[PDB]
Structure 1
Amino acid sequence: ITELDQTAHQSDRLNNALLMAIRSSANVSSGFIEQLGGHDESAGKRMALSVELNNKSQALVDEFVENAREPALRGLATELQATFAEYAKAVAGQREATRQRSLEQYFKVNSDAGNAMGRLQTLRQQLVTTLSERGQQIML
C-alpha cells in the first residue's frame, strides 16, 4: 500500500504545481495593474507572491521528476520539466516587462506563457492518466 500513496503524492505534486504556476502569472498581471494605479508597494508585494508561487511550482515539478521511476512516466516527466522551464522564463519576462513599464512588451511574453501553459496542461493530462493507470494496476 506504500506504492499507492507514492502514486497519489505524485498526483498532488502535479496538480499543485500547475495551480500555483497559473496563480504566479496571474499575480504578475495584478502587480502590473497596481503599478499603473500608483500603488508601487502593493505591486512589489504581488511580484514577491508571483516569484514565491513560481518557485514552489518549480520545486514540485522537480520533485515529481526525481520520484518518477516507472518507465511510462519518465519520458513525459522530462517533457514536463523542459516545458515548465519555458513557462518560468516567460513569467520572468512578464515581471521584466512590468519593470520596463512597457505594455506592448507585456502582451508578447504573456502570449508566450499562455502558449507554454497550454502545453503544460496537455502534459499534465498524460501524466495523470499514466499515474492513475499505474495506481489501478497495483490494486487489481
Structure 2
Amino acid sequence: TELDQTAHQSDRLNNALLMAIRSSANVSSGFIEQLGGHDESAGKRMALSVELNNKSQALVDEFVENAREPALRGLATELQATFAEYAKAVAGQREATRQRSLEQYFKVNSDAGNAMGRLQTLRQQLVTTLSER
C-alpha cells in the first residue's frame, strides 16, 4: 500500500514538472506567433499555457498534501515554494505576451529559467528520497 502511494506521488511529480515547463514553452511560442501575425494560432498557445499551469499546480498541491513522511516534508515544501516562484514567472510571461512587450518578457524570463533550473535538481532530490521508501 505504501508502494502504490509512491507510484502516484511519482506520477504527480513528473507530470507536474513536464506540464509546467510545457506551459512556459507554449507562451514563448505564442509570443513569437504574435510577432509573426499568427494571431489565431497564438491564442491556442496561450490557452494551453493557462491550462497546463492549472493542471500542474493541482498536481504539485496533491504531491505536497501526500508527502507527509518526515524525510519528505522539508523537501516537499521547498518544491511548493520553488514551484510557486516558477508559476509566478510564467504568469508574468503570459501578461507580457498579452501586452506584446519584449521588455516585460525579458524581465521575468530570468526568474523563470532560474526557478526551473532548481526544479530539475529538486526533482532529483525528491526521486532519491521517494526511492528510499
Give me the TM-score of the superposition, normalised by structure 1: 0.91
SS in 2 for 1:69: coil
Unaligned runs of 5+ in 2: none
SS in 2 for 1:20: helix
Q: Take 1:107 and 1:48, find their aligned partners in 2: how far apart are those partners?
A: 21
1:33-61, CA deviations, whole angstroms, 9 ceiling, x for partnerless residues? 11111122221111010011111110110
Show the counterpart of 1:75: 74
Q: Which has the larger radius of gyration?
A: 1
Show the counterpart of 1:137: none
Q: Take 2:98 and 2:10, find their aligned partners in 1: how far apart are those partners?
A: 35
Q: Take 1:7 and 1:130, find their aligned partners in 2: how far apart are those partners?
A: 11
Q: Take 2:112 and 2:123, find their aligned partners in 1: how far apart are those partners?
A: 16
Q: Take 2:104 and 2:50, find their aligned partners in 1: how far apart are those partners?
A: 19
Give me the TM-score of the superposition, normalised by structure 2: 0.96
Q: Measure how far apart 1:119 and its partner are.
A: 1.3
Q: Take 1:16 and 1:64, find their aligned partners in 2: how far apart are those partners?
A: 11
Q: Take 1:54 and 1:102, find their aligned partners in 2: how far apart are those partners?
A: 21
Show the counterpart of 1:10: 9
How many residue pairs are counted as aligned between the two chains? 133
Q: Measure how far apart 1:108 and its partner are.
A: 2.1
Unaligned runs of 5+ in 1: 135-140
Q: Measure how far apart 1:104 and its partner are.
A: 2.4
Q: Would you identify which runs of 4 or more consecutive aligned residues in structure 1 move more than 6 Å?
A: none
